Design an enzyme around this catalytic site. Structure first.
Site, short mmCIF file in Angstrom:
data_model
loop_
_atom_site.label_atom_id
_atom_site.label_comp_id
_atom_site.label_asym_id
_atom_site.label_seq_id
_atom_site.Cartn_x
_atom_site.Cartn_y
_atom_site.Cartn_z
N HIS A 1 -22.90 -22.27 -3.48
CA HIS A 1 -24.31 -22.69 -3.69
C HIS A 1 -25.23 -21.46 -3.76
O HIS A 1 -26.46 -21.65 -3.70
CB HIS A 1 -24.74 -23.72 -2.63
CG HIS A 1 -24.97 -23.18 -1.26
ND1 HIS A 1 -24.19 -23.57 -0.19
CD2 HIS A 1 -25.91 -22.35 -0.76
CE1 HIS A 1 -24.62 -22.98 0.90
NE2 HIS A 1 -25.68 -22.23 0.58
N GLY B 1 -30.43 -17.93 5.51
CA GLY B 1 -29.71 -16.69 5.17
C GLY B 1 -28.43 -16.52 5.97
O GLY B 1 -27.79 -15.47 5.81
N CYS C 1 -25.78 -18.77 5.93
CA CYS C 1 -24.63 -19.26 5.13
C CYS C 1 -23.75 -18.06 4.75
O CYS C 1 -24.29 -16.97 4.44
CB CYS C 1 -25.05 -20.05 3.89
SG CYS C 1 -26.82 -19.98 3.52
C1 LIG Z 1 -27.45 -21.39 4.57
C2 LIG Z 1 -28.94 -21.21 4.79
S1 LIG Z 1 -29.94 -21.90 3.49
O1 LIG Z 1 -31.30 -21.60 3.80
O2 LIG Z 1 -29.41 -21.47 2.24
N1 LIG Z 1 -29.79 -23.56 3.57
C3 LIG Z 1 -29.25 -24.24 2.50
C4 LIG Z 1 -30.06 -24.72 1.49
C5 LIG Z 1 -29.52 -25.43 0.44
C6 LIG Z 1 -28.16 -25.70 0.36
C7 LIG Z 1 -27.57 -26.51 -0.81
C8 LIG Z 1 -26.10 -26.84 -0.55
C9 LIG Z 1 -28.35 -27.82 -0.97
C10 LIG Z 1 -27.68 -25.71 -2.12
C11 LIG Z 1 -27.37 -25.23 1.40
C12 LIG Z 1 -27.89 -24.51 2.45
C13 LIG Z 1 -30.32 -24.34 4.70
C14 LIG Z 1 -29.92 -25.83 4.64
O3 LIG Z 1 -28.82 -26.24 5.01
N2 LIG Z 1 -30.86 -26.65 4.16
C15 LIG Z 1 -30.79 -28.10 4.34
C16 LIG Z 1 -31.05 -28.84 3.04
C17 LIG Z 1 -30.90 -30.34 3.27
C18 LIG Z 1 -31.86 -30.82 4.34
C19 LIG Z 1 -31.70 -30.05 5.63
C20 LIG Z 1 -31.77 -28.54 5.41
C21 LIG Z 1 -29.93 -23.81 6.07
C22 LIG Z 1 -30.89 -23.64 7.06
C23 LIG Z 1 -30.54 -23.17 8.30
C24 LIG Z 1 -29.22 -22.88 8.53
N3 LIG Z 1 -28.26 -23.03 7.61
C25 LIG Z 1 -28.62 -23.50 6.41
#
Ligand SMILES: *CCS(=O)(=O)N(c1ccc(C(C)(C)C)cc1)[C@@H](C(=O)NC1CCCCC1)c1cccnc1
Ligand SMILES: *CCS(=O)(=O)N(c1ccc(C(C)(C)C)cc1)[C@@H](C(=O)NC1CCCCC1)c1cccnc1
Lengths: 304, 304
Positions: A41, A143, A145
């Site tokens: 992603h 950040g 991930c």
């Molecule tokens: C991994 C961090 S992040 O900020 O990229 N993040 C995230 C956003 C979008 C995705 C998609 C798979 C949809 C592309 C993955 C990860 C967030 C996160 O998980 N956001 C979610 C979106 C759905 C509703 C709840 C929040 C993230 C934030 C904090 C920690 N890890 C990830």
């Protein structure tokens, strides 16, 4: 003496964390040999995050689209492929710091250390467990991930978890390093909810054995019980069924404390039925289930 | 989102741990530049442990008496000196892995990561705090002495703790790396008891701010209070007095949550007076006081 939530030393893994950038999104990647692993992603824009076609998004993309940094070091991308939910970037340079490593898919209840990272830079380490609903209650900000979970066996690093996402619940979901999600989670911004989280019964028993070993043995009752009789009370309080596997695995702790597994099960029953009454076990007012029998053995034995 | 007991990455410190042997006793040492630091009670036999004369014991001893190993590497001892309760062994080889390091004497309430070691080999890392009675509730077995506590600031490792001993209490006492004990502890097998352990009030407030930041805000009351009025209830429950230093230090968390320090003090008062009533805060049924305001900021900000 003493009993703490203990993580593995992170040194071998610290040297494997890079920064991966693709357009606007930047996250962590794992650099092993001439391959960088990261969540797929990274190719998404907030446009496509609602229902992305990752195969179609990856096609609109060549090696030089992806920016990999190891501190102040820029790596040339020689290839890209998608393995399930993980991007694999082939790079020119092998990581000189690559340890002896395995990819393992851990089972629910099993524990691992997380090296939490931001911009391919390690910020902290903590221990956590694969919940029975295949989530983890971790500590990840934006950040994070591409942060990885791992065990150290001998000198060999077992990578078992890569962080992908936070569920609106505020708990975390990720993949093994072959890019298969733990549980039924997909990498899209959609209404995903984890199942009923059960308690890892075999871990709570391990933790009670740790309490006995560290002199904290007020909860020891004068009863015993049977698996059947116990499992009826376990199901009632959303505890995982206790198996003949699990009793066997608790054998070492049973032997060293001289407390039969079934006696400890009877002690657990009373705690579930009567609570702690404002008392503590190893300075917790709750029953801890994020310690495996192997975690307790390691910390009560002294395993390097 | 999420909040965990998080240790610093141990990588920089892993490369500094050696094994020190002198006759029968073997423990851990810290190899920085051409100096190996370890507890001076490595020169003791169980004969002299009851009331040792360390100056007289060190006199009956030359360089080649002391055996230093860095894995399969034997270091030549060029000199020995005693600095308070720490032995300093001058060695031929400078440690190639020596990081930018400081020796700091931390204050009660301050936290640090412990790299628990056996035979100069790192086994695990965990976070802990300097209790107000100058003990730590750690996880140390036999052979763990010489294990060090440290903070990472920028790229610089601050060594603040070296493990010496377990008190018959089952809690732990050690020194700064200039060999001065935290608290009134001496390195002899004698009836030593730690003082009344108080709760680190400023840390509990930091932890409650972390709870609010992670959506857990049931305990927020509709009252406020004053330092004086609060400190009267703090003393009653063996909590450390709350200072104008401490309110200033909580400012960042106050600003980001929009909860005035005094409002949170009123919320704490109710919890102390009424308990949790079987409720949890960040999945704890007890009030946690081993998180500093800086720990909470780091984990709720994302500091590498
Ligand atoms: C991994 C961090 S992040 O900020 O990229 N993040 C995230 C956003 C979008 C995705 C998609 C798979 C949809 C592309 C993955 C990860 C967030 C996160 O998980 N956001 C979610 C979106 C759905 C509703 C709840 C929040 C993230 C934030 C904090 C920690 N890890 C990830
Ligand atoms: C540091 C581990 S140890 O096994 O060497 N150890 C210890 C023994 C003797 C000393 C002297 C200062 C008396 C020479 C220091 C440390 C024990 C320990 O602390 N033993 C005490 C002795 C007094 C009564 C309670 C036990 C130790 C055990 C576990 C963890 N750390 C230290």
């Amino acid at each position: 003496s003493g009993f703490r939530k203990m993580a593995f030393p992170s040194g071998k893994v610290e040297g494997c964390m890079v920064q991966v950038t693709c357009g606007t999104t930047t996250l962590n990647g794992l650099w092993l040999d001439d391959v960088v692993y990261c969540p797929r992603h990274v190719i998404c824009t907030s446009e496509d995050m609602l229902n992305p076609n990752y195969e179609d998004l990856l096609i609109r993309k060549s090696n030089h689209n992806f920016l990999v940094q190891a501190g102040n070091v820029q790596l040339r991308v020689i290839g890209h492929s998608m393995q399930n939910c993980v991007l694999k970037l082939k790079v020119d340079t092998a990581n000189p710091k690559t340890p002896k490593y395995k990819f393992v898919r851990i089972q629910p209840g099993q524990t691992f250390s997380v090296l939490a990272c931001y911009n391919g830079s390690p910020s902290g380490v903590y221990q956590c467990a694969m919940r029975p609903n295949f989530t983890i209650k971790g500590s990840f900000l934006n950040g994070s991930c591409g942060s990885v979970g791992f065990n150290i066996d001998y000198d060999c690093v077992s990578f078992c978890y890569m962080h992908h996402m936070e569920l609106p619940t505020g708990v975390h979901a990720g993949t093994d390093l072959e890019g298969n999600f733990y549980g039924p989670f997909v990498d899209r911004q959609t209404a995903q909810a984890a199942g009923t989280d059960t308690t890892i019964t075999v871990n709570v028993l391990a933790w009670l054995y740790a309490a006995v070993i560290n002199g904290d043995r007020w909860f020891l009752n004068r009863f015993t019980t049977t698996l059947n009789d116990f499992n009826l009370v376990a199901m009632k309080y959303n505890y995982e069924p206790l198996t003949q596997d699990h009793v066997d695995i608790l054998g070492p702790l049973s032997a060293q404390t001289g407390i039969a597994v079934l006696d400890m099960c009877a002690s657990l029953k009373e705690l579930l039925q009567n609570g702690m009454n404002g008392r503590t076990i190893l300075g917790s007012a709750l029953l801890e289930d994020e310690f495996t029998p192997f975690d307790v053995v390691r910390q009560c034995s002294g395993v390097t």
